[PDB]
């Protein structure tokens, strides 16, 4: 919803200006890995886009990739920070509390990204398909996948667009076939 947005595109700000301040990227810098295509399966009011911020260093961008995600979490309120948690579950199958989502994350980042099923992806073509995404048609939820350039940072990115996507499911209207729901 409106407070998912908000915090969607602070937490792009602080990913790109975190790889153009920290991990030496521009908008105008070659990329090694291109982004193919780009999809939700149920897509119900998601506009998608992708923004090539690419560098040579995929250590460095990971770095960055989480430490924005560390400050745009640790600056949310209380209130904010409790539906994380159903977030890491349904979207990583992680189980976390809000005190631990932190921690969490970076050793599942650490595990998930640092792990050669992912930096041996010699694929100079990523295609991220997602399965589930919500926005209201009047204001559909606007989401940027940034796209580093390397497999590494992009598990990190595809992990937090996963996070994403899964929230404005959870708080979306409840109903099948228009019919409230459970």
Request: contains cysteine.
């Amino acid at each position: 919803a409106a407070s998912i947005q908000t915090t969607v595109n602070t937490l792009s700000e602080r990913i790109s200006s975190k790889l153009e301040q920290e991990a030496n990227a521009s908008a105008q810098t070659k990329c090694d890995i291109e982004i193919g295509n780009f999809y939700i399966r149920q897509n119900h009011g998601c506009n998608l886009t992708v923004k090539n911020m690419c560098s040579a260093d995929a250590d460095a961008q990971l770095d960055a990739v989480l430490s924005a995600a560390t400050e745009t979490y640790s600056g949310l309120t209380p209130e904010q920070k409790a539906y994380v948690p159903a977030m890491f579950t349904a979207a990583l199958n992680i189980q976390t509390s809000v005190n631990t989502v932190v921690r969490d994350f970076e050793n599942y980042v650490k595990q998930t990204c640092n792990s050669s099923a992912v930096v041996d992806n010699k694929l100079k073509i990523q295609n991220v398909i997602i399965d589930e995404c919500y926005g209201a048609p009047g204001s559909p939820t606007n989401l940027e996948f940034i796209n580093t350039g390397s497999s590494k940072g992009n598990c990190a990115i595809k992990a937090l667009m996963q996070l994403t996507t899964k929230a404005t499911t959870q708080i979306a209207p409840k109903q099948v076939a228009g019919t409230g729901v459970q």
